[PDB]
Design a protein around this ligand. Sequence first.
Ligand SMILES: *[C@@H]1O[C@H](CO)[C@@H](O)[C@H](O)[C@H]1NC(C)=O
Ligand SMILES: *[C@@H]1O[C@H](CO)[C@@H](O)[C@H](O)[C@H]1NC(C)=O
Ligand SMILES: *[C@@H]1O[C@H](CO)[C@@H](O)[C@H](O)[C@H]1NC(C)=O
Ligand SMILES: *[C@@H]1O[C@H](CO)[C@@H](O)[C@H](O)[C@H]1NC(C)=O
Ligand SMILES: *[C@@H]1O[C@H](CO)[C@@H](O)[C@H](O)[C@H]1NC(C)=O
Lengths: 118, 110, 49, 99, 108, 184
Amino acid sequence: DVQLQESGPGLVKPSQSLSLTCTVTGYSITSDYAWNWIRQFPGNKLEWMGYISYSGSTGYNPSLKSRISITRDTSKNQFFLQLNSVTTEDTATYYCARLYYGFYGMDYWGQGTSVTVS
Amino acid sequence: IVLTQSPASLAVSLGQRATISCKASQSVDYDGNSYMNWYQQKPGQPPKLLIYAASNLESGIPARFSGSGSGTDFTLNIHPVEEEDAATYYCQQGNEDPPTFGGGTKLEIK
Amino acid sequence: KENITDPPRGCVGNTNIWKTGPLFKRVLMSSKYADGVTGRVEFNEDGDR
Amino acid sequence: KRHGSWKIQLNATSVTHKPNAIQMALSVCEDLISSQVYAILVSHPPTPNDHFTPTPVSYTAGFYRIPVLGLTTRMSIYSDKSIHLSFLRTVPPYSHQSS
Amino acid sequence: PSGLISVSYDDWDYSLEARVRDGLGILTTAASSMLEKFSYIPEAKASCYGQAEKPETPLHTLHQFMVNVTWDGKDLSFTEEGYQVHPRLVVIVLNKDREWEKVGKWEN
Amino acid sequence: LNIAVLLGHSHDVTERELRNLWGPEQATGLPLDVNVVALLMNRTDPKSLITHVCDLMSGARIHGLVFGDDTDQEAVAQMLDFISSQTFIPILGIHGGASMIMADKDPTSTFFQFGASIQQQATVMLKIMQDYDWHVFSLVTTIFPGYRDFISFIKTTVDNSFVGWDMQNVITLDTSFEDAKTQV
Ligand SMILES: *[C@@H]1O[C@H](CO)[C@@H](O)[C@H](O)[C@H]1NC(C)=O
Ligand SMILES: *[C@@H]1O[C@H](CO)[C@@H](O)[C@H](O)[C@H]1NC(C)=O
Ligand SMILES: *[C@@H]1O[C@H](CO)[C@@H](O)[C@H](O)[C@H]1NC(C)=O
Ligand SMILES: *[C@@H]1O[C@H](CO)[C@@H](O)[C@H](O)[C@H]1NC(C)=O
Ligand SMILES: *[C@@H]1O[C@H](CO)[C@@H](O)[C@H](O)[C@H]1NC(C)=O
């Protein structure tokens, strides 16, 4: 069936840019849709960063657009989140999820990856 | 402009209805439609969408889960209740920006 | 079927048109395609299926 | 192997959808027609950097009237033959669902 | 057939050098209009490989500054579809010699 | 201001004569440098055309690019349209390949032509036909593009005028297909 996988560098020597990789196998990548980045803190609360379609539409937080880059890789059409600075203490989980447009139907979800802001 | 879930640790037994109150400050109801989603999670576990629109059946789970209310208030009704329902449940609006997290209430078993 | 002038050797040295151009396009619009896995590949004069 | 290529053996070549329109048109000019291709096959670009990339292909085909065939693009502007004469498509554009 | 009448452009009077003069007049009038209305002329980028960045005053204004053009009294201004409001035209016919001869003219 | 004249496969007027047309009395009114780069290419290769246009717009700051030749191809006008809409440069068509008419242009283009709209020839031939008192007429056309516009404009002009045209029959045939109906 349609499968997705998320990975990333996670942690290397400091003062670097995380490039978290999200891709989907078994299904077409760039037909319609919403692709959301999701951030969760061990305090059990969620929040939103941004969405990208195939329509080309993009939407991000006004206060968080500073150091977030959504980049393309065409060999399989996987999308990369570039963000500055990775550490260990600020252990938070990140998800990439394709979903029905309008933030309405969360069709798929991410598995979660360790990303830190500290 | 705060969004909450009531209560964090409620009394849940077997067979009756369980009432989770998703209080959203904004006026959710758009053109006669209130964009609600309820989903389950575990710490470190990939979330899965439990129910959508609060009144349309989701493929895989019977009518035990439903949602009522309008505008400022909404209610996840678990009728009846089972034991494995212990999870972090999240209510999410879908009308427009801002995408605002719900209370994410954790279901405890007595 | 036809005595064909081959497609031109690059963009250089060719201020002319390709004589087979109209001929190849005519045999293409007359090209009836049957083994269509996406239904019936039938196209009108307007260059669209 | 299924239709029979006894008299005619086919060499297939393709190029990337260059985001830069001028460089893409150039590459088509010096590479594609130079090898004496008999058609150009272009689908709708999945990357929405510039949706009008079939237009340079149609124009450079029209300069030699070599029939160019589209795959996924459905832009009704291409539907004209007074401009995009050499253009054909396997998928109807939007104007057609008017009918 | 002889006696066939068509319509075309004046290959005799509207000569190539006459067309060059007319086009230079059009461009000079457009440049003068844009210069005298916006106090200067915007400068485009020096590279064809650059990004799609329109200036704070886009060419659209210059576009209509290229629309309202009147050179040498000849109102060669172009409509929204970009065609001259006053195009010089001729009407041609096939004579006895199976040749094309000027018989009709179309001006102002 | 700066003018780009590009003549491909042209042998009519010498380059010295081409820059002779730039009369000082014409330059009166605009004191800025009206650099008239008249370039004679012995070829019309589109790749070389684009390279020359880009180099000249880099080196001379082109404002008006007038293109004329003696060719018989309408594709050059469409590539000029594309370059105009892309690189934000105006181009005008004069002679040869640039002489024939352009049907429809992309709105973002900055192009100009000398050829007249088919509606203009339509009204011109209708009024010369009424000038010679040939009120009787019939219309025939093929499936070459632009015929819907031509037939619609002719019908609308018939509707409004007071002269009283008599469209006995309007026919859009195709002699390539069955000839019997065409003759009928
Ligand atoms: C190709 O064959 C046709 C068939 O008669 C002939 O009329 C034509 O002249 C030939 N082509 C050339 C270049 O001679
Ligand atoms: C339309 O065509 C497709 C493939 O060409 C075919 O699968 C489908 O059944 C057709 N539609 C109908 C109503 O038969
Ligand atoms: C097909 O043409 C390309 C063009 O460079 C060439 O690299 C390739 O070797 C050719 N293949 C065959 C089988 O002719
Ligand atoms: C604009 O057009 C009007 C008439 O169409 C003319 O009188 C006027 O001089 C034009 N203005 C410029 C700046 O060309
Ligand atoms: C030419 O036509 C214009 C517009 O009708 C008119 O103003 C002008 O006076 C005419 N020329 C002469 C010499 O009358």
